[PDB]
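Example 121, ligand sodium ion.
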Amino acid sequence: SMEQVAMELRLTELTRLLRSVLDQLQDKDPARIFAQPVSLKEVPDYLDHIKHPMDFATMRKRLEAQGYKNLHEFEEDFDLIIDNCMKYNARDTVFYRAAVRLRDQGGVVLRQARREVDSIG
Ligand code: NA
């Protein structure tokens, strides 16, 4: 159907917007602390602590399979990266501080993306 294609063009455009957002968020992590999943070989107990791991590479795989239906789903995944880190790592750690900074800096980007998604539909 013709609707299904129109829908697929918007999902495709949403993916386009979300890719740009993902790149901007990832730039706020120059240390690359959140780039890849936490290693289960190096942190073997991690899943005892954190039930839903997340990282920027895993978000990118979902993004490119058009696995994000709306900005809400995408923000959920971004929030997981931050919130998981802030639970597993103590307050006085380079990792916890890096999450706080990603959260603060990412807020500005997410703020405008929500407006863009509402504006362009
Ligand atoms: Na903690």
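Summary: Residues 52 and 80 are 7 Å apart (CA to CA).
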